[PDB]
Fold this sequence. Notes:
Chain A is mainly beta.
Amino acid sequence: GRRIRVQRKGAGSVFRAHVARRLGAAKLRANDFAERTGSVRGVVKAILHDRGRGAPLARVQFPNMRGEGRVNELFIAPEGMYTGQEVFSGNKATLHIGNILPVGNIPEGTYVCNVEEKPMDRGCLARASGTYCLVVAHNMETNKTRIRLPSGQKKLISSKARAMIGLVAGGGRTDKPLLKAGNAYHKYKAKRNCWPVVRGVAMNPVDHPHGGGNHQHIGVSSCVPRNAVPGQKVGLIAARRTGCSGG
Amino acid sequence: VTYPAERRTFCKREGKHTVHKASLYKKGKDSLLAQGKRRYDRKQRGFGGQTKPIFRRKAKTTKKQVIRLTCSSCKCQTFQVLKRCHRLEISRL
RNA sequence: CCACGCGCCGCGGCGAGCCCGAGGGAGCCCCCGCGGCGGAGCGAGCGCGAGACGCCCCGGGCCCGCCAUGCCCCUGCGGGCG
RNA sequence: GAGGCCCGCCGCGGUGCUGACGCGCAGAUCGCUCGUCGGAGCCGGGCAUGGGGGCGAAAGACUCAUCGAACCGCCUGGUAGCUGGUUGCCUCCGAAAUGUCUCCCAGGACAGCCGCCGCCCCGCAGUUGCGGCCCGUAGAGCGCUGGCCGGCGGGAGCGGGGG
RNA sequence: GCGCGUGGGCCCCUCCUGGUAAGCAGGACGGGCGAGGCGGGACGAUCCGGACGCCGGGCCAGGGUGCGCCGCCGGGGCCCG
RNA sequence: ACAGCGUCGCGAGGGCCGCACCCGGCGCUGGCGCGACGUGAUUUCUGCCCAGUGCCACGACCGUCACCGUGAAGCGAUCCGCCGAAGCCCUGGUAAACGGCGGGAGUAACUAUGACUCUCUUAAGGUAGCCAAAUGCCUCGUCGGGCAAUUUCCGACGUGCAU
RNA sequence: GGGGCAAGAAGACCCUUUUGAGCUUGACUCCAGCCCGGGCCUGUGGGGCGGGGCGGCCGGCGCAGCGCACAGGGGAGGCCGCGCCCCUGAGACACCCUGACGGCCGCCGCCGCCCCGCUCACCCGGUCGCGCGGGGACCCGCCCGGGCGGGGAGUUCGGCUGGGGCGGCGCGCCUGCUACACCGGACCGCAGGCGUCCCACGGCGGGCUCAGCGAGGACGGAGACCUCCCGCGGAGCAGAAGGGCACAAGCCCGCCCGACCCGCGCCCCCCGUGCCGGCGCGGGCCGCGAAAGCGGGGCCUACCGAUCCUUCGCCGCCCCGGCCGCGGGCGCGGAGGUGGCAGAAAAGUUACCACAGGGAUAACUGGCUUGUGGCCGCCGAGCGCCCGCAGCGACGCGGCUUUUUGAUCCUUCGAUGUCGGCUCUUCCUACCGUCCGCGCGCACCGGCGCGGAAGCGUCGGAUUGUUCACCCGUUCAAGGGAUCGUGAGCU
RNA sequence: AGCAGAGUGGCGCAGCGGAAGCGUGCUGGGCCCAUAACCCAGAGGUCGAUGGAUCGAAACCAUCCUCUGCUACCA
RNA sequence: AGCAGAGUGGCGCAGCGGAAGCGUGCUGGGCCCUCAACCCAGAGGUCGAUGGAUCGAAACCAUCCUCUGCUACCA
RNA sequence: AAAAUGGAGAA
């Protein structure tokens, strides 16, 4: 047989992210003494576009607490933030869109984004266009806060973890049809070599497990076990159920 | 076929015909100290999988049945090989 | 073709013997020089162990080992004889 | 003044003629005729990815005239029951294509035939005659086993029609 | 005693099996070709004679004897090989 | 290939790959994401079947199913019990998973006919459509159209080898 | 451009080779990966739950006698008063005894398991270590053990064979035949079997007579039973077939286990090797019979299996410096098998394909053949109003051809370019039209038959790649051969 | 091979020592004015075999034949 | 070619070593106020022929006739 | 809780 496309992808080499001309790593401002007690004030210098990200980014300039200059942070932009806004990242921060406060401080029912999976992780959950997490409940004895991830799954994260108030901007980007293959090529060129996609039933027996016969058929069931081998997991992995259904 | 529960046959220790009770011989459990088990266990150890032939093309339908005739007094065990038969019963006394 | 191993045939030396082994001899075609092999076999072994004749060949007869079976007796599951 | 819009030059492809060529101009070129020609476009330089690996809008395509596993050296003068060849002369003898076994059926072993080397002495024959035993084929026959074609003569009971 | 080649055979005569048959397949006794020169069968591997060192003379097999082409006549019968 | 359309896995103490190891890629990523797959714009739809084979159960622990550990015996090598993790089995779920979609009876009042209820295999019996089609063996099907004449063609019909 | 089966090229198709390769999967054997368990890494404290062992304690419902008798007890006194032995069942129970199966303890310095911390191992995040965290004795890692695992390796994929496949098995064995009277004979020849069944269907002794005719005898007839009579086997003897058998080898009884032990030889197949099968003995022990005898199964000819290994029996030896116990080994010979039967451990696919070869062998041309396809002749039952023959001719019979397909495998596999058309030449006659005769059921017209006759004609089109077919049309339209004429002529 | 389980009227399927159940089919009563449902009877099971042990066995325990599940494979 | 099944009343379709059977047609008889149903009678067979095989065959077996489904090896 | 049915037309 031949190594399949999935196997060839993990060595990078042509399938590595097209990261040239990307602004930088969008991350929440680092936790600092002035964040832990009180709030640091930043000004949104610019709202720009990341090459591979649908959501707009934002250059917010905070003062340098450590020294004498000014430090620039790159943040995923909540909708409604504007150039020349004053954004406060702190334990004592007001509940306005853009501000970063610890999740215990954030009240229940609040739309939050760029939430930290664990305190001082500088950003993890709810970072894509339109996506948000909501505060569900706070256990003040366990210092833990339940949040609902955009998937629906409920995660108990430390009350110390920080989040930016608001819903990420770029909302409703996938509503528009791509319409042409060309529009897809332009989107993927800013991302990685994953497009165009050839179906395995199109490929010859060597190239893919679905492979090929006199007629294009999946042969055995597409469902594969979770404990498949690395070149064998190709169809629906560990499917609990398959098929279109109600709900 | 059926085999008599007791038969009169030569017991070698006695040197004369004696009443011999009859029972069915069975192959016994293979030992791990036999020289062939020992050689096969050594050979099998390691990489390379199966090192000895495994017979699969079975054509026989019956096994020649061996009757253990144990002499009533001497305790001499003698055995008779009956011609291939599907069913053998040793009649009760 | 050459090497090496085996079978058999011829030939040379010596003969119950036979043999430039490796080597060593101010010596390498000279001298001296072990195993080995043969001389006893047979049995898984413990072990036991050949004569009776005969140009030669073949056969029979008998002896030795292995296996059985009697009988006798020492130093006895040993010895003798069949 | 919008468009993976149309006609159309270069460009980039390569349809048909199954045209030319086919000891070529050329180890794939040529002439017409074509597909497209603002786009998933075309083109240069640098760079990345390496052999059971890469890369693939998928043709098992492409990876330096090499790809259903590149190339170079070695292992390697790989192995072949399979093909081809195997070099002077004279004389004396001279087969076999069969029996049995074999993953045997294009091969071998063992026997037969055959050659050479002898060795030893006792009578030898693919022959006829004469004697003794055997054998079930040709023919012949229908008693046996199986068939068969009809005539004639009897009736115990029958199987049908008659009276 | 040592050993080699061989272990695809095929034809003729007669006797056979399967097949509509076959220059078909499969058998049997002997012979032949294989591995057999030569003369004849116009031609041919096997047919009919004859089985072979090199020659000279003689005989004559098989098969023939108009002319190619060596060698023929005589008699009786038949007659669009 | 494609846009669209589904399906699947996955919350980073992760998923999927690379990978002799050290360590990597997706990922300067974060579910409007990433990876894995089918089908392939619209328009209109996508039927039935979980038996079989996949796949999935904080779905049980039924039967099995190891080292280890723990008993018993032994002179000890050892042997015999027990214990029993996943897995399978068991039970459910699942067909835009792979795939399947047939027969047999009974069933008037032309008499065929079942329209209805009943069985069998093995779970279900082919629904809406479509058709002698690039899919129909018989076949150069039959019935129309077109021709002077048509193994082609077009429209019909359809127990349709084998939609 | 007709031929040099012209030149290209160790046929690519097909087959063979104990020659490959690519691919596949529930082929054989496996391997990374991953999941899971236990151990080590690996500190410091709790808490629960079992097991094992003790150990008290509470229970036990088919009814006569005393009520549900859990069981094995013991017994005329324990301590009831009841007892008993009564009076009772399937077994009495008094005071004391244990034994099993449950429940309810408690216990323990015993042995597992699970849970909860802690922070110090370890493990990640954040920071310009600028005023910080998150886990945590887990996880990872590692050693073992068990799962999944064509993702990936390595290998294999029988034989015979009128080519191979498919389908059979003369692939081990047996009977009658083929088989041509010793023996031996071949076929994917003929008609059939075998892989088992029976402690009796065996051994032995005695007695007996079988299948049936025929004739008889309540129900009773085709058919059951009972008699005589005559019965050469016409019955039976496990199964194929052929032999064999009558005071028996059949049948029935009575007794038995030789359907033993030990050592050999021989015959069949045959290399005169195995193996199955038989047979002939020298002993030991038996059985049956009065004995003589007979018996190593089943009357004979079929019914089965090497080495290595395993397992078991018997009697001994050996473990090599001793000796003892265990264990291992060995000599002896049974069993567990190799049916592809003298005995690898083994699935497909390949049109993506090879390799070495093969005309030992298919497709294709020729050649042999001629079933089949054509095409004739003979006979004359009938048809034809009548009338066998104008024209027909059944039922049968005898030929011919190579324009049909088979049959075969002779030639070609280091290659004879394989269908049709198109083009163009030639040939054949078994003659469709025209020519010349002649016959008609020949008035004419037109048909039909036959003999000679191959000079000329046998076309144009619709559909199909078609050869063929089918239809339309004309001046009405035969059939063929030349490597299925014709590809360095073409398409 | 081993460890486990199963086999019950014509058919399906309960049933743990002390009966032979229930469904269906069948055959009839009833039912109703007459149907169809419905109700109720009746018959139906070497309780695969075979042997034991038991007061007594469908049950227990062996065997022997099928069937299932999981694991096993020096010949 | 060769393979399987059948051939049974007029139509069907059973039977399967001891008859011909049921439906329909097909009349008749009931039945009612009449009609429809319905019920019940009556009848219908070289069992495709032949030979065998039997005490006896539609049956079972051979031959044959007829139908009806299955059929050709890439190179 | 369940509880459909009931030829022709003639009075």
